[PDB]
Structures are given as structure tokens and as C-alpha cells.
Subunit: 242 residues, 4 copies
């Protein structure tokens, strides 16, 4: 009945927002889920809520995406727990984005830090996960950039998003023969109070603004067997914002 | 329980191949379906199979996608049968394909005929369907190009596919304010016996070739409520063949 | 001294606008030029201006891009006049544009007519020109879409422009082995009095609006020997209007 | 007579290959040129050869693209020398690329270092140059990724190339109102002994492989006034390699 029944998945950035909603959605579709995030407590709590009092199908793992050794330890603990791996969901912070100013005032350190976490983190996680995906007989990696007058600011986020798309194509090309798919999702304006943002409505093509469930549904689709002929692709989930 | 419960869909080119498998899939997902194609008997026969001896949730209609008047009659008889419209699936032949030779030998009449059917047909169908979609409270149009040596031949087919993608964006932009989404699916090599095409497997990223069910699954996802924040997009379903 | 010394070029749509300015520019860069358009007198008059009273390096030919036979006669009379061919510039109206309404009201006959002229015309011209380009030792075809509210209207024009880009790639792929390059130019808002359009200036990135000379300069670059490693490409000349 | 007469340009990575050929080409087109590179001696020597015994129109400056303060000092020394700035050409190493292995064996440190130099370097240079371009009444920045079965390896170079394209669009968007254009060039296989590579010929669409002069000619075009209506664009110079 679950669209991901019997699957094992890792979800990074799982303590809040898109990651948290996705992590609950994969589990509700029958996936066993390792939730991973900087915030140890936030991810243990969510894991506990997903498990309920009877369940064993979720675990919370502490990870620092900027630390390759921490990223490798996380993938090993998840494989250890559930005995394998089918899905890796790499997830990309208000002040963080507040620091990502236009090029004229941009701080090179914020760029360096942004690439380290958003690109180098996903790359290392992917590299750690690949042999486990391959031994499973195949599986998939799904890269989600963070939620997006977008070219007018946050250029480091824009640059890392484009880099992540290139990583996605690199991995799909390199791992395809071994049965691994790799796809990206590029969310537009995702509201994690929808009423305060309604000025943005005429700039969308849809009649509503984005929800984290929109990204989660896309992750369920791309992770499922019925999408197994899709790889190297970027699914834009943005209500037409462009 | 079905992922498309209570919905009403039109599928053109539904007598065989991808259109046929998709039409069966939408009905299996709980949609009421109007099947349209040039081949009248073939479409009633399939409508009859989907329906069963005592069912009513599918109808077969004869349509000529080249003739605007025939396309408009088909949309009206679909709505007249089921009382509304939620989904329009425009689906774009071996002989016809053999006539689509490289540019050096290309016949302008083949190009003309190709645009009339693959492009104008989809535009007119879309035009006819739009007010019914809008009155329903919104809905979606899904344009499926025909399945793909790539650019080395079938240039009229490739031209019309790019044109179809432009139509998809034109419609998503123009109709989005009224609640209509419009997306495209670009299938790669789809096999509607896999053995004869094994030589193509190293050209793919994935370890298998495509099936009409791959396109049908993408149509179910894009036609469903949990994909309602996606519009103006092209989903390539090609196993990486590029 | 000219950047196109000793070269022979065909320019279609050369009676007015972009075609006219481009034809003058190629001749000023030292090319011999066959000017082609529906408007016979307008094209001889301009050929006569370029030529001067005692010159021979330009000729005006009457062509109907909708009729394959007329297009083939034009290519042959161009080659017959100058003894060879190096460059074919396919150039794609206010009334015609006013007929290209949004999809809701679109007329299929306008779409048909648009593909016949903008697409099939360019394909047939290209087809006719190819063996002359190949025999010359190589050369190039440059396809120029018509100048751009964007997707909100003129959908037949946008469809045919995407189709033209696909044709450009089809031809670059198929003819590259024989030494022929094929590229496209996509002009944005081109003014062929800038004052009436000042409202458009905030929509642009650049501080001025476009001029036919902007498209002509891109054609000189793409037609020249120092651009011979560029093929299959679309150069957008739109001041950032997107 | 020069196509860049009276212009002041900076060229980074100017000690060898594409940078060196471009730097000589801009000067031959009448530009005053500050050549900048890690290799102090290689850039002084080339500057000296461009100057001849009579000239003053070139200078060699030592720079470390990974060091923001060094990048800022370089832009100031160039402005100091020539009294202004019109063009910034940011240029992206055999062992360097030898270290950029497929994802499965990728070193996160090489990724970090690659982004620091290729992306953070161009960003800082651009940021340093912008007020000087703007005070000049406008000008342009041209970003060139390094020369490219390309997705099969060098993924960090691929990722930084995509990021650089995003930087290009960010800058074009942010600086456009102030009269600055920003464009990217994406070279394919550029041979800096053409005979040892001829196995690659059937994978190209052209009849020859790339030369550094192909990139230089593209830089001359994009830097010139007759390209002033082009911004935010990526010119692919790859003979069809794709």
C-alpha cells in the first residue's frame, strides 16, 4: 500500500522544514528512515514521533555536512541500523541567507562555507552511499537545493544550486551502469504562515504558494520504482515562478 | 484509494502504445476516461476492455487531430459523457517516422503534416479543454511528445517536440492564473520485445530500456493533486539517453 | 579589411528590418550578397543602393518562403550570380503578429501558416543551400527567429522559434562532418524610435533597447572564419530581457 | 582599426594557454591590458613581448586567485596603471585535473580548492572591478571556464563551471542597471599538438579541434561595443562536442 514499502532511506537536513516533512512522508509510505541533521535533539525527537511506541522504522543521527568524516560516519550508522540502503535524499537558515548578499557586497568566506556544506556535503554523502546502493542492486540519490527577484540576491545559494545540478548529472552518468539513479529537485518559494507572503501570488503561475509537502511528494515519486527510468533530471517545483 | 479518484481525463492517441497504456493506468487509478484516436474501432475495443461488461467509466471517441472541428467535437462529447474535465493528456507511426528523413532529403509536406498533427492538434485540444478545466476549479494539461540516433534523424519530429514544449510554457503562463497547470513529458526510447534493442543499452545510463508504463507513471504523478505546484515543466523520461 | 572578404551570402527577409540592415552590413564587410524577400521591388531597390550605380556585389531576388519551389529557385539564382555560396542567413509582420493571439483565441490556420513560413521555409532554404556550402569547402547557416509580453502572447511565434532552434541543432549535427556550421540568433525586443518603448527599459538589464545593428553584428561574428569552432549554438541578443 | 581601441582590460590566468593568447589578441585589437597570473615571471615576460621596445600598453601583475586580498590588490594596480577599466576577463593545470577524479574516489579538499579558485576568485575579481566599470560609464565582465566523455570525469571542474555560469547571471542581473554586461564562454576541447588528439574528431561536429584563438575571438566579440546588447549569456565554443 505504501509507495516505498521495504525501502531504506537517508534524509539529511531532516530536523525541520522540507527535510522533516519529507522524512515523515517517506516513513508514511513504508520506508525505513535515517533522519540526519546538525540538530541532534530535533532529529531524535522527530525519529521518536515517527516510531510511535511500537515502531522501529526511524532513527535520528547527528551529522555535520561540512565535516566529511561526520558525513561518512552518518551513512555507516544508517546502514548498520537498517542493514542496507535504497534512497539517499541530500537536503541543503534565515541568518544564513541574510549573509548571502548581492555580489557587490558578497563575503568570499560565506561563498566558501556555502559550497562546503551544500555541495561538498552532498558529494561526500553520495560517495559514501554509492557502494551500498550498488550492492542493493541499485537505488537512487535525490538532491534538493534549498527554497528560492531571486537572481537579484542570494548569489552564493544560486551558484551552489547550479553546482548541485551538475553533481546530479555527474553521478547519474558515473553510477548509471551500476543501477543508480540520480535526480535533483529545485523548489521555488516554499512556505514552511502563507498569508504574510501573498504579495508573491501574482508572480506565481499557480493560485497558491508552495508547501513542504510539494517537495516531499516529488521525492516520493522520484524515489519510487515507477520512476526508475528517470535519471539525471532536475524537477522544478515552483508553481511557475521561474 | 486510486491516486486519481473522482477525476475525468481525456487521452488522445489512446488506441495503442503509450496512449493506450496510459488510458488503462488512469482508469486503474480511479479516473473516468475518454479515449480518443483516429482508429475508431481500436479505441472502442479498449474502452470496452477498461469498462468491463457492466462498467461505465471509459468511452472511446473517434478523432482526427489534424482537423480542428473533429478535435472540438471530441472534447465536447467527453465532457457531455462525464459532466466535466480534470485532465487533458495530449499524446503525439513507424511509416510516418520512416518518412521523417534527415534534412538533406526532407520533404516539406511531411514537416507541414507533422506540425498540423503534433502541434496544432494539441493546441486546439488544449484550447477546447481550457474553459472546462477552469470551470471545474482548475486542472491540468499534459503534453507527451513522441518517443525518440537522436538529432541525426527525424528532424521534423524533433522540431515539433520543441514546439510542443514552447506550447506547454505558453499555456502554463496564460492559464495559470485560472488554476490550470500545463506540463510536458519527453519520452526517450520506449519499447511498446526488449531483446532486439539490446545494442542500445550502453547508450543508456539505466540498466534497462523504457516501457510505456514509465510514461504512464509520470502522467499519473503530474495529473495528481500532490503535483499541483508543478507547471511549465518538462519531465524527461529517457533513462539518461540524453 | 572587411571581416567577410570574398564571401558569398544569401539573406532572406532582406527587404526591411533586420534582414535589410544585416544585408547592408554583410556587403560592407566585403561579402557578395543575394537579397531575398516577398517584396520584389523593395529588395531590388535595396540591392541597387548597396551596389551603387556601378557596383555588382548585390542582387535582389523575389522569393515566397512558403513555397518550396520558389525557395529552391532563389538559392539557384544566387549561386548562378556569384558562382558559389558561403553563408545562408534565414530571417523569419505587425498585422501577422496581431493575428498571433493567446491560445484561448488562437486560430489553427495562423499556426499552420506560421510553421510553413518560419520553419519549413528555413528548412527548404537550408536543404537547397547545403550542397553548395559543402562543395565550397564548408560554410554556415544562421537562423534568426523573429524579435520578441513574452510567453503571455504570440504563442505560434514562440512555438516556431523553438522549432527553429531544433532545426538548427538537427542541421549542425547532420552537416558538421561535411564542414557546415549552423547557429541560431534569438533577438529580444528590437526597435527597427526608442522613445515610445521607454516603459520597457526597466524590464531590460542593459540601459538601452535593441537595434537591428545588434543582430547584424552577431551575424557578422557567427558568419566569420574566427567563429568556425562554433556550431549548434543559440546566441540570445536581448539585453537581458529573458 | 582595432575592434577594442581605447579599451582597458584585465585578463587573469594570462601566463599561458587561452589567457595568454587572449591577452595578446586584446592588445592587438588596441586594448591596454593588465595580464595577471600566479606565475609572476611568465606574465612579465609576455607583457614585455606585447609592449615591444616602444609600447606601454601591457603590464604583468602577480595574483593568487584563491587570496581575496591578492585579487583586490591586482585590480587596483591595473586601474592605477591605466587610469580606468572596461573589460574584466576571468580565466579559470594537468595535475590539477588529474586530481579531479570521478565522484566515487573524489577528494572533498580538491572540490573545496577548486571552488575557492575558480568561483570565489572570479566573484572577488568581479566585485573589485564593478565600481570601476560603472564609473567608466559601463563595461563588461567575461567569465571563461577551463577547457572540457566529460561527465564521466572531472566532476569538480564541471560543478564549478556551472556555478560560474550562475555567477555570470547573478552579475548581469545585479549590475545591468548600471551599464555592466556579464557573459560566459564555455570552451570545449581546446588544443594548446593537434595530431595526438585526432581520435576525438568524430565526436566533434566541426572538421577540426579547438584552438585558443577560438576562445580569444569570442572574447573580442563579447568585449566589443557591437555586442553591447548581449548579457547574461553563455557562448559555447566546442565545435559541437556538446
Amino acid at each position: 500500500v505504501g509507495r516505498l514499502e521495504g525501502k531504506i532511506a537517508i534524509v539529511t537536513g531532516a530536523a525541520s522544514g522540507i527535510g522533516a516533512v519529507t522524512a515523515e512522508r517517506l516513513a508514511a509510505e513504508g520506508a525505513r528512515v535515517a533522519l540526519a541533521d546538525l540538530d541532534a535533539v530535533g532529529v531524535q525527537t522527530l525519529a521518536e514521533k515517527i516510531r510511535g511506541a511500537d515502531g522501529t522504522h526511524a532513527i535520528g543521527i547527528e551529522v555535520d555536512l561540512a565535516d566529511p568524516a561526520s558525513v561518512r560516519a552518518m551513512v555507516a550508522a544508517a546502514v548498520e541500523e537498517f542493514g542496507g540502503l535504497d534512497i539517499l535524499h541530500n537536503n541543503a537558515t534565515a541568518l544564513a541567507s541574510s549573509l548571502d548578499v548581492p555580489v557587490a557586497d558578497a563575503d568570499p568566506e560565506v561563498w566558501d562555507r556555502t559550497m562546503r556544506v551544500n555541495l561538498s556535503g552532498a558529494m561526500v554523502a553520495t560517495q559514501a552511499a554509492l557502494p551500498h546502493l550498488i550492492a542493493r542492486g541499485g537505488g537512487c540519490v535525490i538532491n534538493t537545493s534549498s527554497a528560492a527577484s531571486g537572481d537579484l540576491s542570494h548569489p552564493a545559494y544560486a551558484a551552489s544550486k547550479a553546482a548541485l545540478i551538475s553533481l546530479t548529472r555527474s553521478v547519474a552518468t558515473q553510477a548509471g551502469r551500476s543501477g543508480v539513479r540520480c535526480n535533483a529537485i529545485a523548489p521555488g518559494l516554499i512556505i514552511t504562515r502563507e498569508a504574510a507572503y501573498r504579495v508573491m501570488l501574482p508572480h506565481h503561475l499557480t493560485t497558491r504558494l508552495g508547501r513542504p509537502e510539494d517537495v516531499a511528494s516529488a521525492v516520493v515519486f522520484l524515489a519510487s520504482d515507477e520512476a526508475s527510468f528517470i535519471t539525471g533530471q532536475t524537477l522544478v517545483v515552483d508553481g511557475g515562478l521561474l
